[PDB]
Design an enzyme around this catalytic site. Structure first.
Site, short mmCIF file in Angstrom:
data_model
loop_
_atom_site.label_atom_id
_atom_site.label_comp_id
_atom_site.label_asym_id
_atom_site.label_seq_id
_atom_site.Cartn_x
_atom_site.Cartn_y
_atom_site.Cartn_z
N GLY A 868 68.09 13.35 6.86
CA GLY A 868 67.66 13.55 5.47
C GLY A 868 67.84 14.97 4.95
O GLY A 868 68.55 15.21 3.96
N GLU A 869 67.21 15.92 5.63
CA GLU A 869 67.12 17.30 5.15
C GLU A 869 68.18 18.25 5.70
O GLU A 869 68.32 19.37 5.21
CB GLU A 869 65.73 17.84 5.46
CG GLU A 869 64.61 17.08 4.71
CD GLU A 869 63.25 17.39 5.27
OE1 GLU A 869 62.49 18.15 4.61
OE2 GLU A 869 62.95 16.87 6.38
N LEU A 870 68.91 17.82 6.73
CA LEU A 870 69.99 18.64 7.27
C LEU A 870 70.93 19.25 6.21
O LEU A 870 71.17 20.47 6.26
CB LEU A 870 70.82 17.89 8.31
CG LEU A 870 71.95 18.73 8.92
CD1 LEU A 870 71.40 19.99 9.64
CD2 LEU A 870 72.82 17.91 9.86
#
Ligand code: FES
Ligand code: FES
Ligand SMILES: [Cl-]
Ligand SMILES: [Cl-]
Ligand SMILES: [Cl-]
Ligand SMILES: [Mg+2]
Ligand SMILES: [Mg+2]
Ligand SMILES: [Mg+2]
EC number: 1.2.99.7
Length: 907
Positions: A868-870
């Site tokens: 998600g946040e990568l």
């Protein structure tokens, strides 16, 4: 009023309308065409695109007087329906263009308008079209949308068969790792998935519609509220204030750290004694419609004493500053990071040191769908809330004491939702609608407009940062020092935790044996902090990844090679003293290196006197999980019809909770040969689904993925026949054997970071990546264009490639916004998509390149990490490093507005 006889979706409509009415309202409310989505309401997002007499128009800014008698209108319902999909809809499904799906009808309608005028467009033509028609997407980074248009065009043009728009099984029959479409795609592309506002239009008469009476100053003592005029206004039922709240009238931060100097009960549900930020809800008007409620809300008079407001962290953190929450210091939390030896003597004796002051600001999430929720009293006596919560169990506990209900007497449900990017890690409207439903006994519905979405939902918290590196001449990092001040606005929820992220992620990616740093959290009167995708990493890693380039520059070393020298290898530890679980950064750098060299050469070759090209690098790292021994639960159930329901509370922002569940379950269930179409997911519901946890911290694929795997494994055991094979449902039922089977999973090896040292093993799985940004700077104007982005990504193993490709493209686009255009600093000017620097299609390069360098995770399901946040960890650092590469100027404080860049260029 006028009669207008027109054709809508091929059917003659005998319409009776106000000439001044908006076509969006007429289509949605009068004709029930809720496939026409409305977001911004100001002609800026294209979600409400319709075809009117061959032209693509925004229905929200098209008055009925502009609709001629005999006009032809096409909405998504007219493009195609489930079982009768148009090539554009089939293509959207195939290319994964529907993430949250909120912009999908508008893009598809717009695309049909394009293809009806230009049957064989170039990719550039498609991009120009979506730019002109203002079709905005926050989820996908646009590339999949263009892919879809191109594929549909080829079919319409007879250049390939329509059957090629249908997914083909890999058979092996393995859907794990594949491009299998997501279950919700068809509903999204046909406009038949009802989001919160659509549900509001389909609720019964007697549903009350709410409007917020909000503070128009940033800080005040409240003296009184006069509702008298509002009560006399058309359609007004009542006005709700703090007096009507049956509980504490506070939201609890719930997991407030013990060393936090605040008790975590600082946030009111309805303001009582104080206004803490502009936009604070002071009262709710209940009326027969949103329009009538809003009109009446304007007449509610709040008597208040305005107080001096602290509109930035440094301002609020001054030794002298007045306590915003009397009895708690404005600086209410500090997190040290103390690793290895004292850094002072190491800096003193090091060959090279560097230092920088950096700033990343109050990035607004800007989902296309503005916040919306509803509540009602069930026949069972419970209070039901349906909202955009991405942590239904979390929010239940955060609000129950405030609303005055025991946990068993409240039920939270996640509606289908048009994106959040983290703002829904916070309660927004849930306690408000609960209070109103309890007080009135009636169903209530609350829709925020776009200005309210901007001003009165939480924001990425600004960080003021100073970071320093000491290193050897050969580039070996010796030590780091760090200081960060986190401006969390007035409400403490997860502010301490966000601050802790700085200890975990400043300088992540490299072996740094000796660290001394200190994070501080400060209450201010600017917007309260809610998680924004990356949650502390975009701040932390902007500082450290910019500082790495400064270190390289000072050493006369290539910035990629400096990273290669330092990147995690076996034996190393991360900033919290923990061993990385895989070592993929050297691999990723090695594979990127030639592409980097080629990009540099192209930059030099193609730079002109006026347009300077540059290439920039950064590393990103982030945890998959909430801190410590995070856990999830799922139930795998064989149903009577032979289908299997996998029950979870995996909350879908739009990232792909549906396909995550289906793909993970399918892989786990392979021994029993379960077709993917037979596997059902569950929408989050606190009463009927297990506590799988929130969709925050890029955690669900790992935590709930594992839980799903375990539950499916346990179902397999439950179904196993002695001698081989599997029992059917009827067989198990005949034997009085269980058919609904629980699985649980816990990240048992994880530990919380220490309050004194910051050391610990907070996550058992991380995501790792290497970004390359390619940019052009117009040195006359200071305008930066991102011409390409590359992400080397180690996701362990892909549950679904349509999902992971889209996640990365979406994060990269938000990276471009964070780097160049986005902020929420001016309460009014930044309260629109265009005002706040939303990236429209031309701002995002068509060249978004992913290379997966997957190192299976020991603890991830089938080796998977999250994703998600990568892609938002540090793309903005790569971009700023690229501007530096291009022009020699470094922007330290985001965003790199053209004037800011010009001032640096001419200095
Ligand atoms: S352009 Fe109409 S809702 Fe945004
Ligand atoms: S899929 Fe486009 S806004 Fe979410
Ligand atoms: Cl954040
Ligand atoms: Cl700057
Ligand atoms: Cl500017
Ligand atoms: Mg057809
Ligand atoms: Mg070493
Ligand atoms: Mg100037």
């Amino acid at each position: 009023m006028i009669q207008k006889v027109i054709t809508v979706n091929g059917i003659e409509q005998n319409l009776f309308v106000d000439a001044e009415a908006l076509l969006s309202d007429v289509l949605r409310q009068q004709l029930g065409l809720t496939g026409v989505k409305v977001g911004c309401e100001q002609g800026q997002c294209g979600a409400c695109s319709v075809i009117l007499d061959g032209k693509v128009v925004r229905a929200c800014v098209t008055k009925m007087k502009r609709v001629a008698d005999g006009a032809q209108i096409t909405t998504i319902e007219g493009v195609g329906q489930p079982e009768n999909l148009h090539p554009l809809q089939k293509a959207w499904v195939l290319h994964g263009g529907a993430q949250c799906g909120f912009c999908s009808p508008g893009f598809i309608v717009s695309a049909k308008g394009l293809l009806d005028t230009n049957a064989d467009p170039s990719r550039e033509d498609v991009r120009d079209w979506f730019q002109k028609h203002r079709n905005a997407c926050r989820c996908t980074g646009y590339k999949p949308l263009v892919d879809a248009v191109m594929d549909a065009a080829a079919v319409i043009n007879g250049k390939k068969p329509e059957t090629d728009l249908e997914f083909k099984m890999p058979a092996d029959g393995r859907i794990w790792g594949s491009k299998y479409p997501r279950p919700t795609a068809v509903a999204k592309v046909t406009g038949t998935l009802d989001y919160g506002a659509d549900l509001g239009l389909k609720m019964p008469a007697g549903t009350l519609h709410l409007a917020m009476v909000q503070a128009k100053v940033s800080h005040a003592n409240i003296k009184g509220i006069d509702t008298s005029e509002a009560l006399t206004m058309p359609g007004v039922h009542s006005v709700i204030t703090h007096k009507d709240v049956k509980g504490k009238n506070r939201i609890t931060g719930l997991i407030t750290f013990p060393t936090n100097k605040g008790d975590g009960w600082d946030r009111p549900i309805l303001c009582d004694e104080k206004v803490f930020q502009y936009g604070d809800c002071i009262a709710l008007v209940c009326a027969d419609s949103e329009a009538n409620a809003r009109a009446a809300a304007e007449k509610v008079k709040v008597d208040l004493e305005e107080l001096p407001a602290y509109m930035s962290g440094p301002a609020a953190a001054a030794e002298d500053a007045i306590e915003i929450h009397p009895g708690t210091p404005n600086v209410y939390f500090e997190q040290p990071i103390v690793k290895g030896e004292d850094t002072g003597p190491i800096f003193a004796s090091a060959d090279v040191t560097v230092e920088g002051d950096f700033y990343v600001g109050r990035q607004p999430h800007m989902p296309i769908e503005p916040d919306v929720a509803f509540a009602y009293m069930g026949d069972d006596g419970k209070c039901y809330i349906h909202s955009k919560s991405i942590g239904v169990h979390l929010h239940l506990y955060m609000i129950a004491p405030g609303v005055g209900l025991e946990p068993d007497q409240l039920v939270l449900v996640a509606n289908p939702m048009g994106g959040t990017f983290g703002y829904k890690f916070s309660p927004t409207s849930e306690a408000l609608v609960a209070v109103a439903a309890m007080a009135t006994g009636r169903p209530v519905h609350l829709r925020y407009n776009y200005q309210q979405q901007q001003q009165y939902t939480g924001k990425r918290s600004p960080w003021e940062m100073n970071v320093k590196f000491a290193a050897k001449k050969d580039g070996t990092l010796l030590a780091m020092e760090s200081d960060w001040l986190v401006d969390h606005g007035p409400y403490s929820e997860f502010g301490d935790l966000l601050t802790l992220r700085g200890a975990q992620f400043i300088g992540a990616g490299y072996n740094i044996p000796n660290i001394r740093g200190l994070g501080r959290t400060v209450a201010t009167n600017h917007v309260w902090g809610s998680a924004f995708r990356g949650y502390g990493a975009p701040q932390s890693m902007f500082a450290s990844e910019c500082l790495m380039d400064m270190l390289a520059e000072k050493l006369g070393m290539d910035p990629l090679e400096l990273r290669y020298k330092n990147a995690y290898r076996p034996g190393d530890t991360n900033p919290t003293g923990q061993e990385p679980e895989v070592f993929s950064l050297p691999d990723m750098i090695d594979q990127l290196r030639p592409k980097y060299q080629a990009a540099l050469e192209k930059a030099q070759k193609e730079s002109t006197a006026t347009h300077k090209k540059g290439v920039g690098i950064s590393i990103g790292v982030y945890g998959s999980g909430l801190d410590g021994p995070d856990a999830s639960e799922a139930w795998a159930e064989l149903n009577a019809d032979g289908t299997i329901t996998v029950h979870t509370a995996w909350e879908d922002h739009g990232q792909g909770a549906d396909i995550g569940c289906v793909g993970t379950a399918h892989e786990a269930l392979r021994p029993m040969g379960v077709a993917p179409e037979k596997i059902k997911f569950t929408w989050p519901n606190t009463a009927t689904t297990p506590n799988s946890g929130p969709s925050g911290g890029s955690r669900q694929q790992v935590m709930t993925g594992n839980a799903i795997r375990v539950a499916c494994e346990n179902l397999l055991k439950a179904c196993e026949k002695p001698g081989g094979g599997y029992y059917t449902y009827d067989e198990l039922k005949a034997a009085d054997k269980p058919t609904k089977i629980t699985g649980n999973w816990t990240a048992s090896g994880a530990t919380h970071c220490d309050a004194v040292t910051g050391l610990g093993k907070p996550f058992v799985v991380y995501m790792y990546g290497v970004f390359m940004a390619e940019v052009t700077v117009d040195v006359a104007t200071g305008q930066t264009t991102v011409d390409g982005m590359t992400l080397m990504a180690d996701l362990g193993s892909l549950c679904n490639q349509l999902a992971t490709d889209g996640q990365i493209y979406g994060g990269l686009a938000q990276g471009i916004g964070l780097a160049l255009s986005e902020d929420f600093e001016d309460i009014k000017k930044h309260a629109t998509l265009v005002g706040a620097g939303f990236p429209f299609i031309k701002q995002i390069p068509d060249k978004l390149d992913i290379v997966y360098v997957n190192h299976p995770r020991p603890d991830g399901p089938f080796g998977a990490s999250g994703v998600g946040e990568l892609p938002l960890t540090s793309p903005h650092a790569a971009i700023i490093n690229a501007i530096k590469s291009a022009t020699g100027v470094r922007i330290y404080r985001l965003p790199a507005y053209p004037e800011k860049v010009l001032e640096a260029l001419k200095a």
